[PDB]
A paper describes a structure:
The human genome encodes two homologous 12 kDa FK506-binding proteins, FKBP12 and FKBP12.6, which differ at 18 residue positions. The primary known physiological function of FKBP12.6 involves its role in regulating the RyR2 isoform of ryanodine receptor Ca2+ channels in cardiac muscle, pancreatic β islets and the central nervous system. Similarly, both FKBP12 and FKBP12.6 can bind the immunosuppressant rapamycin to form an inhibitory ternary complex with the protein kinase mTOR (mammalian target of rapamycin), which plays a major role in regulating cell growth and cancer progression. X-ray structures at 1.70 and 1.90 Å resolution from P21 and P3121 crystal forms are reported for an unligated cysteine-free variant of FKBP12.6 which exhibit a notable diversity of conformations.
A survey of crystallization conditions for the cysteine-free variant of FKBP12.6 yielded two distinct crystal forms, one belonging to space group P21, yielding a data set at 1.70 Å resolution, and one belonging to space group P3121, yielding a data set at 1.90 Å resolution. The peptide unit linking Gly89 and Val90 at the tip of the protein-recognition ‘80s loop’ is flipped in the P21 crystal form. In the P21 crystal form the backbone ψ torsion angle of Gly89 is −131°, compared with +2° in the P3121 crystal form. In addition to reversing the directionality of the hydrogen-bonding interactions for this peptide linkage, the side chain of Val90 is significantly displaced. On the other hand, similarity in the backbone trace is recovered within a couple of residues on either side of the peptide-linkage flip. Regarding lattice interactions, none of the atoms in the Val90 side chain or in the peptide units on either side are within 5 Å of any atoms in the neighboring lattice molecule. These considerations provide credibility to the anticipation that the flipping of the Gly89–Val90 linkage may be significantly populated in solution. Likewise, the positioning of the side chain of residue 90 in this crystal form of FKBP12.6 closely follows that of this FKBP51 structure.
Residue numbers in the entry: 1 to 107
Write the structure that this text describes.
């Protein structure tokens, strides 16, 4: 599943909803610390839509438990990421993924 370790609290009231556009900064790492993706390098927020299957399952599941202004470390098991196949490029089979995520806005 998804483990959430809070670095900075959100308001604890305002969470992502169906029909909303989620606006976040994120950085994705393997367990060994290596980066595979980021929004922070381009220095601009990344947007994705709840329920629209635009990101891996674990990432959305984690974000949906975050409130406005929260920054957290999401630990995501392979079965809700890329699983036994991994993905072309950095991500190997059975990769538990680490995401540094900040929930900036909901549009």
């Amino acid at each position: 599943g998804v483990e959430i370790e809070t670095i900075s609290p959100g308001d604890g009231r305002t969470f992502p909803k169906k029909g909303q556009t989620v606006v976040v900064h994120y950085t994705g790492m393997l367990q060994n610390g290596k980066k595979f993706d980021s929004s922070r390098d381009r220095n601009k927020p990344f947007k994705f839509r709840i329920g629209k299957q635009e990101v891996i399952k674990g990432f959305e599941e984690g974000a949906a438990q975050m409130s406005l202004g929260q920054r957290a470390k999401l630990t995501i098991t392979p079965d809700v990421a890329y699983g036994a196949t991994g993905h072309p490029g950095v991500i190997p089979p059975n990769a538990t993924l680490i995401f540094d995520v900040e929930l900036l806005n909901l549009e």
